[PDB]
Design a protein around this nucleic acid. Structure first.
Lengths: 214, 97, 62
RNA sequence: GUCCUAAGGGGGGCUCAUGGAGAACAGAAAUCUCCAGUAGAACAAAAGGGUAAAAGUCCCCUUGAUUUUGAUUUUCAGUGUGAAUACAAACCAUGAAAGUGUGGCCUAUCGAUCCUUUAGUCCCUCGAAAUUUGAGGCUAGAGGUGCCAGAAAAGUUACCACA
RNA sequence: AGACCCUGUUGAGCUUGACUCUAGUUUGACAUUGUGAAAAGACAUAGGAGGUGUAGAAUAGGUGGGAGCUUCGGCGCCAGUG
RNA sequence: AUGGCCAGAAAGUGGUGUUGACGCAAUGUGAUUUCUGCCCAGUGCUCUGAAUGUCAAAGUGAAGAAAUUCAACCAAGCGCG
RNA sequence: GGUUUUGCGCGAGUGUUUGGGUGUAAAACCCGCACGCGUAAUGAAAGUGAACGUAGGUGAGAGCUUCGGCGCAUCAUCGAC
């Protein structure tokens, strides 16, 4: 995979998403991956998280799980939060946890409360793929929120098809290039043999026709 | 059917008679009747008699703190541990069956 | 076929590997038959070079 | 590393953990006395209803460590007075007695200087040089014959021969 | 210095699913090996059509974006089951 | 008979064979008289009847940069019937 | 071809005789390069490589002594590289 072909694909993607057809909401640029020379049904399923240079998802919500100081930090940061007494009033209610996982798209929990997540909420968030990100008492909450927003995962499921929201149309071309290149390089580094295990790479927007790279 | 029972059925090993498997034997040296195992059994002979002679190489290779008055109990515990290892393996296989 | 060796015969008959066997077992001879025929051959003591009995015969235990 | 007339069984007597109030040393915590104490102690199991003049704890007696018989059950027996096994009956132990209870539990064996397996990034070498696989060496770990490999080179000679 | 018995790192003849081999036999492949026709199976596409164990519009490929699509009839998140 | 039974290190080699089922070869029993304890179907004898179950070499496909590894396909016999 | 002991030469060296020169001719005499063993060990290997001290301290120890001690070989022991 070279430079200029992917740059041309990104430029055509932006041209179609901005000039040819524009919706009433901000579209999201996604990368879809097919894998060859590897099968998850007989080998170990890998996982990994990487911080993109730019925040790919603008329309998402983050749920903060912490004490009253964490709630104060969250209301300074402008992010909603819910407390441990609400965790006990939940008490592993499967329907409420399902609704919370369907509503909130990212979760962040403090280090003094993340030990109570399997005791009170169980493995529901880990099953749904929205397990909360640990944050310490000295870390900047705004920086941690930005890191969680820019962080995408490449966990290997039971199927070959993979999808990562790498960016959005509201970005610029160079930042979309940076996000796509970092995601591709992280996936290559996660793969055992690099480009040999890559089957096909495809980039598109939410309402756009796809463009093939590999 | 356990592993020993299958092996004995294959090899034609007859079960012992009740007189043969008694916990009783005649000690000639003392001229007395003694038990093969159990309380004051013959498998712990010399653990309480006043004198045991020991080998110099055996005492050199013996770890510190351990005495000669516990070697027979050590061997007994090793054999007993192997016996329950086999018994638990047989029980697990029978439970799977 | 499979082979006329005794190992091939045991594998064909599905015997348990590592089992002991009596010397002389083959396709025609089981352990019971071997013991029964060896009864007819027993009865001679083991001797040294000068004829002294070093191991007694069966049921002659001295 | 020390201790035991073993456990088990039968019978009898007693009630525990804890709290309150009392007693020279004795002072949260030593022992004794009373009261209250559904077991909150102990013993087995894993109650969503185990056990209180007991299934707990101490005394008395047995401790004989695996009885005898069977034409019956199941398996086996080139050593067929049958053996093992199940069941039954008798015996036995205890108790004044009604009764209660015992007359076993298991398992192929062999290596540990063995077998299987893992790691080395900043360990060494692959000898014309370099890189990447690979291989060998050296070092350090893990586990233990279910998933630690394997463990099948017989006879006869009255046709004979030699030392 | 026979015969008999005893011993052997014993010798030799013979037998047999004893061990390892082997003559013969049988089967396949390559070559010798040239000149022409005709079938069948398997993979690939250019693709088309499907897919209920239960619950649940749907007979649930799954995955990622997604609350909006909208060809103007409406389809949708939301509600419910997994 | 492009056969059977043999032989030879092999051969454009030999025998049976100057042979052809009333023949050749291999067995067992052993003149004549008598004679087939009764019934099967475990071992064996033979059926190209379906299977790929086992399945060698050669050949085919995939991965890798290659050494190499992994897959099917897989004759006879064995296995099943 | 080893190993221990005896005698001999030389001695941190030692061994002329594969070969050359020479000869009164298989003798004797002479010559030297390389090489063998020894002079350094250890490590699988890459590799590295033996003085703190009058080449150390303590106790013995023949012999000598200026009669205070100096102390061979060797032994035990603590150190150093």
């Amino acid at each position: 995979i070279t430079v200029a072909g992917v740059r041309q694909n990104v430029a055509e993607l932006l041209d179609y998403s901005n000039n040819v057809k524009k919706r009433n909401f901000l579209e999201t640029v996604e990368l879809q991956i097919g894998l060859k020379n590897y099968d998850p049904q007989r080998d170990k399923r890998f996982s990994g998280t990487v911080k993109l240079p730019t925040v790919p998802r603008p329309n998402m919500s983050i749920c903060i799980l912490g004490d009253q100081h964490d709630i104060d930090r969250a209301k300074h940061g402008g992010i909603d939060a819910m407390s441990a007494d609400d965790l006990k009033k939940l008490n592993k209610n499967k329907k409420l946890i399902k609704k919370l996982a369907r509503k909130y798209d990212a979760f962040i929990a403090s280090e003094s409360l993340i030990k109570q997540i399997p005791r009170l909420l169980g493995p529901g968030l880990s099953k749904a793929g929205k397990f909360p990100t640990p944050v310490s008492h000295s870390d900047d909450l705004s920086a941690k929120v930005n890191e969680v927003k820019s962080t995408v995962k490449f966990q290997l499921k039971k199927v070959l098809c993979m999808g990562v929201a790498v960016g959005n149309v509201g970005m610029t071309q160079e930042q979309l290039v940076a996000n796509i290149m970092l995601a591709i390089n992280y996936l290559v580094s996660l793969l055992k043999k690099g480009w040999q295990n890559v089957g096909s790479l495809t980039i598109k927007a939410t309402m756009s026709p796809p463009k093939r790279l590999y | 059917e356990t592993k020993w029972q299958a092996f004995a059925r294959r090899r034609g090993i007859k079960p012992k008679t009740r007189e043969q498997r008694r916990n009783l034997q005649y000690n000639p040296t003392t001229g007395q009747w003694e038990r093969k195992w159990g309380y004051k059994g013959a498998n712990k002979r010399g653990e309480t008699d006043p004198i045991i002679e020991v080998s110099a190489a055996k005492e050199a290779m013996r770890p510190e703190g351990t005495s000669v008055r516990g070697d027979k109990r050590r061997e007994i515990r090793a054999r007993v541990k192997k016996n329950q290892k086999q018994m638990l393996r047989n029980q697990r296989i029978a439970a799977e069956k | 076929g499979t082979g006329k060796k005794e190992k091939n015969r045991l594998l064909r008959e599905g015997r348990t590997p590592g089992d002991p066997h009596v010397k002389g077992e083959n396709f025609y001879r089981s352990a019971k038959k071997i013991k029964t025929l060896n009864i007819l051959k027993e009865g001679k003591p083991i001797r040294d070079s000068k004829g002294k009995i070093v191991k007694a015969a069966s049921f002659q235990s001295k």
